């Protein structure tokens, strides 16, 4: 059966404006394994996104970690956008340093 991806976005280090950091997008609980993941800066696709090898959990659902270098500022937004056969519309989750 099809399972919808969960998406969590979080920084590697405490966010400090103007300091290089790494932004993580962890995508879990999906089936089938095929998936497209984009990371976005101010709504534009970020070109250098690295991704772990996909694997799966004990419940058989798949997961993968995407990550990118970023330098947070007061005004830049960042998001992770995922396309998966389980939903007609891509799903977007924004980084929110306060959450």
């Amino acid at each position: 059966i099809q399972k919808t991806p969960q998406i969590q976005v979080y920084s590697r280090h405490p966010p400090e404006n103007g300091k290089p950091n790494i932004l993580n997008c962890y995508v879990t609980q999906f089936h089938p394994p095929h998936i497209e993941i984009q990371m976005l800066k101010n709504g534009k696709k970020i070109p250098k996104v690295e991704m772990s090898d996909m694997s799966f959990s004990k419940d058989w659902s798949f997961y993968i970690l995407a990550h990118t270098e970023f330098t947070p500022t007061e005004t830049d937004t960042y998001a992770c956008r995922v396309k998966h056969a389980s939903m007609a519309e891509p799903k977007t989750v924004y980084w929110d340093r306060d959450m």
């Binding site: 059966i1 399972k3 969590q8 979080y10 920084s11 590697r12 280090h13 405490p14 966010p15 790494i22 993580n24 962890y26 089936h31 089938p32 394994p33 095929h34 690295e50 772990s52 090898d53 996909m54 694997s55 799966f56 058989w60 659902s61 798949f62 970690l65 990550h67 929110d96 340093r97 306060d98 959450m99």
Partner: protein, 263 residues
Amino acid sequence: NYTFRCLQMSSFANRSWSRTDSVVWLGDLQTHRWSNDSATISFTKPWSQGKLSNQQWEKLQHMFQVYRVSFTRDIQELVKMMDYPIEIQLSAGCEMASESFLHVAFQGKYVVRFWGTSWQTVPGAPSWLDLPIKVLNADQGTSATVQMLLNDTCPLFVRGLLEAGKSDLEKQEKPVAWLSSVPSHGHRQLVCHVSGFYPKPVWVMWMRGDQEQQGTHRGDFLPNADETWYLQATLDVEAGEEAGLACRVKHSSLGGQDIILYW
């Protein structure tokens, strides 16, 4: 004691397109990857060959190379002998005395295991699997090989991985924590973020003095890309009542000096 898992994922889209990719884990550390694009299994640690000689490793790898081709052909012929797309997953390995496992899922549901000396369908598995499992069970060569892998090779290999990978397996990395908050009217959700720790066991609690706040809501463990962990723990609080709250973090890497951040 650890758990060793070989995780195979195979996707068949039609008669003309399929792929098989595997990853291998010892505890939470990835030790191998085997991409569909690669003829050979890739080490993701310096110590991924464990204590196997080059000859023992090459023998074991050849076995898998033959298996990968045969598995793909066999599944495609099963489908022809009978609905695409098809997803098949295999989870095989051992835990510790040691006990081994080989579980198979079809379309994301557990349907078959190897147990003792034969393949079995699990109760509730679709009845069309019974005949092909029968025919698979008639292959004594395969049965015998699987028995040797599960009973002998898996724990042997794991013992060597544990020895060779000692410094990584027993590495300690320190958490760094930070606090933030969001509205949740008057109420706010406080967030204690904890990142970069290894190994996984950690204790994170909101506190008022020496009193643990049982509203502490711990999230899931989320991986960082550098083989450390991230966790956050939240606390709903009434307006003004934020004063006096602290997040306390205990971790093996800290040598008994907890992190305490004050709101």
